[PDB]
Design a protein around this nucleic acid. Structure first.
Ligand SMILES: [Mg+2]
Ligand SMILES: [Mg+2]
Ligand SMILES: [Mg+2]
Ligand SMILES: [Mg+2]
Ligand SMILES: [Mg+2]
Ligand SMILES: [Mg+2]
Ligand SMILES: [Mg+2]
Ligand SMILES: [Mg+2]
Ligand SMILES: [Mg+2]
Ligand SMILES: [Mg+2]
Ligand SMILES: [Mg+2]
Ligand SMILES: [Mg+2]
Ligand SMILES: [Mg+2]
Ligand SMILES: [Mg+2]
Ligand SMILES: [Mg+2]
Ligand SMILES: [Mg+2]
Ligand SMILES: [Mg+2]
Ligand SMILES: [Mg+2]
Ligand SMILES: [Mg+2]
Ligand SMILES: [Mg+2]
Ligand SMILES: [Mg+2]
Ligand SMILES: [Mg+2]
Ligand SMILES: [Mg+2]
Ligand SMILES: [Mg+2]
Ligand SMILES: [Mg+2]
Ligand SMILES: [Mg+2]
Ligand SMILES: [Mg+2]
Ligand SMILES: [Mg+2]
Ligand SMILES: [Mg+2]
Ligand SMILES: [Mg+2]
Ligand SMILES: [Mg+2]
Ligand SMILES: [Mg+2]
Ligand SMILES: [Mg+2]
Ligand SMILES: [Mg+2]
Ligand SMILES: [Mg+2]
Ligand SMILES: [Mg+2]
Ligand SMILES: [Mg+2]
Ligand SMILES: [Mg+2]
Ligand SMILES: [Mg+2]
Ligand SMILES: [Mg+2]
Ligand SMILES: [Mg+2]
Ligand SMILES: [Mg+2]
Ligand SMILES: [Mg+2]
Ligand SMILES: [Mg+2]
Ligand SMILES: [Mg+2]
Ligand SMILES: [Mg+2]
Ligand SMILES: [Mg+2]
Ligand SMILES: [Mg+2]
Ligand SMILES: [Mg+2]
Ligand SMILES: [Mg+2]
Ligand SMILES: [Mg+2]
Ligand SMILES: [Mg+2]
Ligand SMILES: [Mg+2]
Ligand SMILES: [Mg+2]
Ligand SMILES: [Mg+2]
Ligand SMILES: [Mg+2]
Ligand SMILES: [Mg+2]
Ligand SMILES: [Mg+2]
Ligand SMILES: [Mg+2]
Ligand SMILES: [Mg+2]
Ligand SMILES: [Mg+2]
Ligand SMILES: [Mg+2]
Lengths: 77, 46, 93, 61, 102
RNA sequence: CGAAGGUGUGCUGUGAGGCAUGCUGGAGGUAUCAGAAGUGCGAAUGCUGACAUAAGUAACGAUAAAGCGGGUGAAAAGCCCGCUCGCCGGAAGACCAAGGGUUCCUGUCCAACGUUAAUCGGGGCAGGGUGAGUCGACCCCUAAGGCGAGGCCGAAAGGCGU
RNA sequence: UAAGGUGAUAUGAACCGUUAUAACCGGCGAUUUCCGAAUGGGGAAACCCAGUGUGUUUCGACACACUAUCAUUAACUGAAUCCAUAGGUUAAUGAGGCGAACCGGGGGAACUGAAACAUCUAAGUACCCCGAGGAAAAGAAAUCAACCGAGAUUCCCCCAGUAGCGGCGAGCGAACGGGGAGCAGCCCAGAGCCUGAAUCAGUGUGUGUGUUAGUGGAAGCGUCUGGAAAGGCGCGCGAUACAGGGUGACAGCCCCGUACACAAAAAUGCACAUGCUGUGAGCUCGAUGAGUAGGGCGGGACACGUGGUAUCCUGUCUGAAUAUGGGGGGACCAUCCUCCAAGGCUAAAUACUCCUGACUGACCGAUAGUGAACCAGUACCGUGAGGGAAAGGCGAAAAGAAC
């Protein structure tokens, strides 16, 4: 549904603002991409729909750390 | 002159019948309102 | 086969009438008023047993309850089943 | 008459049920043909069948 | 517990025949009593062959308010009231003016 | 030994009003001094009910059409029986589907219903009546289309679809 | 508990009962068709059609049980593909649906006001959606204050229509501080001392104390009027009972109650006493929350409309220090003071009433009061969502008018 599987980032709402300060509603979507992540420690690829920010989490924590967090919450991959 | 109500029992049921109502969140709210009011007959379904 | 408890329920009454009288003294048919859910087979069984006659065939139909009034009230009598039961050849009861 | 039959065997009142049921039927017919002036009777068998089937129900359980 | 019962002998307190006595005949759930030869009425009665054959007029008893009758002592020869106590295990009724069981 | 309410008559105050009493009614009423308001109606093409007016006036729904004799009946232009006359006949005849649901048949009744009368009725009341291996449904098989395990997609609700 | 009973319109007929297996009242059981989440498959709701067992048969048939989906766990099994993995089957456990308000969260109008209207207002309101509990939510300071000090959260009264915000228009509108209600604090990021030691929790035990039927419950007569006396007149009595209701007109003493005093075979609520069953207290030393705080860009929340604008949240791109450290004190800097974010849990004061009992009203009394005092969400209207009435009173007693 356009939800980052790593972080949780989903669409949020807010306002366009003109020079005359007319406000119309809008959405701010995440920067999602489907991406095959190599897991060394079970010799396969896993595909997560993830946001640019969630990829920086995976670089830092390491995929094995992150896929433990995914299993906890019971979100499938 | 042909008038607006041309009866058909099959169409009455597929449209306004009990199971039709039960098949949608909106239709289930119709039966919930009609029970709440106290209606003696929820739907058309003889 | 059918258990007897059941059989004791499926017959409900004899049904009198001009037509029933005639049916009896012409085509050797007894006209009963039977349980709404009783199959033809259960009727045949129940008669054979509970009256000790022999039954050729049963016919059945469903009578619809008439709508009535009782002083500005709407009523409705119950639907009920009517069996025509032809016996074999020479029995009577 | 509950105690009068509370003690008698499973089979004993298993046979009691059927001849109650048989009487119910016989009443039903005579009633239906205006040969029953004792209406109260067919009410009583009904309540007897009731209290047999209950007694069956506890023993079996 | 009911203070006055079937087959009691009572004196009328109130109404067209104040003062006069009779036996209780049967007791209604409305809180009324039939009392033999008390509240007599003249019912006009239509004929009907099967039950109550002829026409004719009738006298019969009409129900009377039970509050309007009193258990009659027949020792004082006067109206009375009823209490409740146990004479050895069984609730009983006693006059109050003369505390004897009845 | 007659409350409120209703309807008369008499008296009385500058006014909104007050007091007395006949008849009706058949169980409530409230001096005084204070207190509180759903506190006063002729109008809003006001709202609800009732009753007038036009007026015993227009009308009684296809211009296919009736006439007489008998019957029953409190009563017959209209009902029943008969004779004659008329109208439809690719329908104004007959059988069905859909839709309706006892309107079907007998007996009984004429208050209301029937644009009149009604002994008559699709009206009231009671009783009867619908019988299937082969007719139809159900059943087997699919069309458009619908629902749709997993699935794909979407803030949620949901949307598509194997 | 009892001398009367078989619910109403509603009689009648057949019966049942009177000293206790008649009826009636309460506790625990039994039975409980079909449809409906509906769950064996289907379906135009209350119907159509099955599969597998186990049992039975008069060989025609019969009765009962089980069989939905998803989530988790376990076993068994298992492709492309060697190990695997995905998948498949069975079982166990749980969920599903309904419901009046209150509560937390995801979305989010316009009419209207500005005497036009776009910023602003209406308003984070109506409405839709998700989730929850008897309440929820919030909660033990990276909080305030002013160099004096205070000490978690919630709610009430003030401060104050003040300070501010504002096409500085219409309007919006705090805090600091003070007075009250209620009061409570703990735990993980970890090893030794060390135990069943704190007491949260589960399940039996007694004992109290409620609940669900019930029992006893004072004392008045005469006489007038009248259809009838409870009213008038006369003379008595009760009162821890003169609340209230009924009875042929207005009754402390006619009846039912009321004050007060009593009661439970059975089930269950709360509180102490408590075995046992999981449960860990105390002390020492250490540790102490990173794609995080901060930043740029776009928005939102703060009374505060980007303004000189601190503080909070983050869609997007970035990114520290780590106690010799870090956050805040309304641009910003220095000094000083105060606190320790990136991990949790927590009772009471507070919100509400679909429903149950009791009691109350300067609330209505049939065009009023609920739409509905009456068989009303009915009759009727509408394809449907939905709309939606009218209609109470014989008499004390039917004695409801024989002939
Ligand atoms: Mg706007
Ligand atoms: Mg045949
Ligand atoms: Mg048939
Ligand atoms: Mg008078
Ligand atoms: Mg008045
Ligand atoms: Mg007054
Ligand atoms: Mg005044
Ligand atoms: Mg007014
Ligand atoms: Mg007027
Ligand atoms: Mg005027
Ligand atoms: Mg006009
Ligand atoms: Mg004229
Ligand atoms: Mg003229
Ligand atoms: Mg004319
Ligand atoms: Mg004409
Ligand atoms: Mg004509
Ligand atoms: Mg003629
Ligand atoms: Mg004519
Ligand atoms: Mg049809
Ligand atoms: Mg009819
Ligand atoms: Mg006919
Ligand atoms: Mg006829
Ligand atoms: Mg006439
Ligand atoms: Mg007429
Ligand atoms: Mg007819
Ligand atoms: Mg298809
Ligand atoms: Mg699905
Ligand atoms: Mg979409
Ligand atoms: Mg689909
Ligand atoms: Mg007993
Ligand atoms: Mg099913
Ligand atoms: Mg289904
Ligand atoms: Mg099928
Ligand atoms: Mg698996
Ligand atoms: Mg739920
Ligand atoms: Mg909400
Ligand atoms: Mg606007
Ligand atoms: Mg304006
Ligand atoms: Mg204006
Ligand atoms: Mg909201
Ligand atoms: Mg709480
Ligand atoms: Mg919390
Ligand atoms: Mg200090
Ligand atoms: Mg008592
Ligand atoms: Mg007493
Ligand atoms: Mg007198
Ligand atoms: Mg007196
Ligand atoms: Mg009176
Ligand atoms: Mg911390
Ligand atoms: Mg930041
Ligand atoms: Mg900043
Ligand atoms: Mg910014
Ligand atoms: Mg400014
Ligand atoms: Mg700062
Ligand atoms: Mg900060
Ligand atoms: Mg400063
Ligand atoms: Mg944060
Ligand atoms: Mg309360
Ligand atoms: Mg209440
Ligand atoms: Mg009135
Ligand atoms: Mg009304
Ligand atoms: Mg309709």
């Amino acid at each position: 549904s356009r939800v980052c599987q790593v972080t949780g980032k989903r669409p949020v709402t807010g306002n366009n603002r003109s020079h005359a300060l007319n406000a119309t509603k809008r959405r701010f979507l995440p920067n999602l991409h489907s991406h095959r992540f190599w897991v060394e420690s079970e010799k396969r690829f896993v595909t997560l729909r993830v946001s640019a920010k969630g990829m920086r989490v995976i670089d830092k924590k390491g995929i094995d750390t992150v896929l433990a967090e995914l299993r906890a919450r019971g979100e499938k991959y | 002159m042909k008038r607006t109500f041309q009866p058909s029992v099959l169409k009455r049921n597929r449209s306004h019948g009990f199971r039709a109502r039960m098949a949608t969140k909106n239709g289930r709210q119709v039966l919930a309102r009609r029970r709440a009011k106290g209606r003696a007959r929820l739907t058309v379904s003889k | 086969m059918i258990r007897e408890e059941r059989l004791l329920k499926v017959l409900r009454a004899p049904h009198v009438s001009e037509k029933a009288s005639t049916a009896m003294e012409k085509s050797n048919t007894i006209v009963l008023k039977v349980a709404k859910d009783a199959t033809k087979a259960e009727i045949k069984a129940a008669v054979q047993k509970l009256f000790e006659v022999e039954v050729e065939v049963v016919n059945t139909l469903v009578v619809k309850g008439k709508v009535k009034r009782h002083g500005q009230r709407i009523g409705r009598r119950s639907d009920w089943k009517k069996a025509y039961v032809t016996l074999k050849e020479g029995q009577n009861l | 008459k509950a105690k009068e039959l509370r003690e008698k065997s499973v089979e004993e009142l298993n046979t009691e049920l059927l001849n109650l049921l048989r009487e119910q039927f016989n009443l039903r017919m005579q009633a239906a043909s205006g040969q029953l002036q004792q209406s109260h009777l067919l009410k009583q068998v009904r309540r007897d069948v009731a209290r047999v089937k209950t007694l069956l129900n506890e023993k079996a359980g | 517990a009911a203070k006055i019962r079937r087959d009691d002998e009572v004196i009328v307190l109130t109404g067209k025949d104040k003062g006069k006595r009779g036996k209780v005949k049967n007791v209604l759930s409305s809180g009324k009593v039939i009392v033999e030869g008390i509240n007599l009425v003249k019912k006009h009665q239509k004929p009907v062959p099967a039950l109550n054959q002829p026409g004719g007029i009738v006298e019969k008893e009409a129900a009377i308010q039970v509050s309007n009758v009193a258990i009659f002592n027949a020792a004082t020869g006067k109206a009375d009231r009823v209490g409740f106590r146990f004479e050895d295990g069984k609730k009983v009724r006693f006059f109050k003016s003369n505390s004897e069981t009845i």
